[PDB]
Design an enzyme around this catalytic site. Structure first.
Site, PDB file in Angstrom:
ATOM      1  NE  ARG A 115      50.575  51.137  33.590  1.00 42.49           N
ATOM      2  CZ  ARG A 115      49.352  50.498  33.260  1.00 42.49           C
ATOM      3  NH1 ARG A 115      48.410  50.625  34.451  1.00 42.49           N
ATOM      4  NH2 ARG A 115      49.332  49.293  32.520  1.00 42.49           N
ATOM      5  CE  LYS A 151      40.113  45.403  38.588  1.00 41.25           C
ATOM      6  NZ  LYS A 151      39.914  46.902  38.564  1.00 41.25           N
ATOM      7  CB  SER A 169      42.921  45.526  35.271  1.00 39.22           C
ATOM      8  OG  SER A 169      44.314  45.835  35.786  1.00 39.22           O
ATOM      9  CB  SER A 184      42.915  48.760  38.165  1.00 41.16           C
ATOM     10  OG  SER A 184      41.871  48.843  37.360  1.00 41.16           O
TER      11      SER A 184
HETATM   12 BR   LIG Z   1      45.630  48.978  34.736  1.00 37.76          BR
END
Ligand SMILES: [Br-]
Ligand SMILES: [Br-]
Ligand SMILES: [Br-]
Ligand SMILES: [Br-]
Ligand SMILES: [Br-]
Lengths: 245, 244
Positions: free
Chosen positions: A230, A53, A98, A50
């Site tokens: 993350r 994106k 996402s 993602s």
């Molecule tokens: Br994600």
């Protein structure tokens, strides 16, 4: 002083605390100096998932596939596993949640020839779109390292990509993730699950009054349980480096 | 239903802080307004630093400001607000409400073009009488909380007569607060030169599926209470479940 990339293995304490493994890469734009906990992993190329994106948004906007950040992308009526995907989206909410299906439709309208020309112009990762035009960033040939994410992000920050200034402004709006009186974070999450090893991404930058800190992190993500690490691990590093209070 | 409704329950948030003022909300989806005080909602005051929104737009559209990176060098006059005594770009000038930067913009814009632009914008009373570099502080211009929302709604939709680019950059410059629940684009003001002394906060809350425009002002006899502009607005947004 003058060093291009400096290794700081003390950041591994933040990964180890959460029984996890990965890399954080920082770039101080003013000083033109990079910092990482792992020089090798910093330069290891993975599926963008993602994080793709960001360039996909830019290409869709520049080609008129997306008119603006208000254009509504109607849900196709297929119930998918992520609840937030099963409704209409604009570019802001599609980026925030996402929403792969929206971006797969973008990719099909962009098409392989123009997707390829654009990624070459962007010098994006290995510039390899081999696989399905609508899934190559998830299970095709494209690979990008944390340090290559930062190179691409720096061009976006400075409106130096070979797409319209407008395209770049809108995507940077769409990337907005966090803001307060100390800092602004423009960023994009990713979770690569289709091809081993499963990894989590967070890439973007911290805007301060007088500087920009670009960042790209990835980490081993065997289950979705740890997706929150993350951002949590990146913030522990930004705090240690005094970039955010 | 009704275009405007009074909600006197919000006066408890002013009472709690021993303060007096108005909060005006506009639900963009429903095209409905809410306020604690319809009378005060329509009282016109000096815009003070809330004028930095139209000033920014006009400066950008005329090329007086090239972009949000252009550096405005400190003139070397030490002023009372520490953060003003440094170089600024549009982002930091808006964030720290750096009057002198905006005074220079206004001089380069000039009376004729400033006046035509405020007419085109339908901004407040459209009256720039006084000094071209201080009329928003002690000149003729006046705007109500309800008139702030009219102007803000045009900016949100890129419907002002200036370039889309101008509108995008100012909306970037307005960025105040963001998380997974909401985004706030806003501008503070503190009018002290003509009575009554008031604090402003005007802007909007972006949600996934709606926008809530807001304009609040309150009596501000001293700078001690400037924090209540945001605190009282947030008490109202939370009561209305607009933000958690
Ligand atoms: Br994600
Ligand atoms: Br633009
Ligand atoms: Br001129
Ligand atoms: Br923004
Ligand atoms: Br102010």
């Amino acid at each position: 002083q003058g060093k291009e990339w400096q290794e700081n293995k003390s950041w591994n304490a933040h990964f180890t605390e959460h029984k996890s493994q990965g890399v954080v890469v920082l770039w101080n734009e003013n000083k033109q100096q990079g910092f990482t906990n792992n020089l090798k992993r910093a330069n290891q190329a993975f599926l963008p998932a993602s994080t793709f994106k960001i360039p996909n948004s830019l290409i869709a906007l520049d080609l008129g596939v997306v008119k603006d950040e208000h254009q509504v992308f109607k849900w196709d009526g297929q119930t998918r596993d992520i609840a937030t995907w099963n409704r209409d989206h604009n570019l802001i909410t599609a980026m925030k949640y996402s929403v792969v299906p929206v971006y797969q439709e973008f990719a099909r309208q962009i098409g392989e020839a123009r997707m390829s020309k654009m990624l070459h112009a962007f010098d994006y990762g290995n510039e390899d779109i081999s696989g399905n035009v609508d899934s190559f960033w998830l299970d095709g040939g494209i690979r990008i390292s944390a340090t290559e994410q930062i190179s691409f992000l720096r061009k976006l920050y400075h409106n130096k990509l070979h797409v319209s200034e407008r395209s770049q402004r809108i995507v940077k709006q769409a990337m907005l993730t966090e803001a307060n009186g100390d800092y602004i974070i423009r960023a994009k999450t990713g979770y690569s699950t289709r091809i081993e090893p499963k990894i989590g991404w967070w890439v973007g930058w911290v805007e301060l009054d007088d500087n920009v800190w670009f960042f790209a992190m990835n980490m081993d993500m065997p289950t979705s349980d740890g997706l929150g690490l993350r951002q949590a691990i990146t913030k522990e590093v930004l705090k240690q480096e005094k970039i955010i209070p």
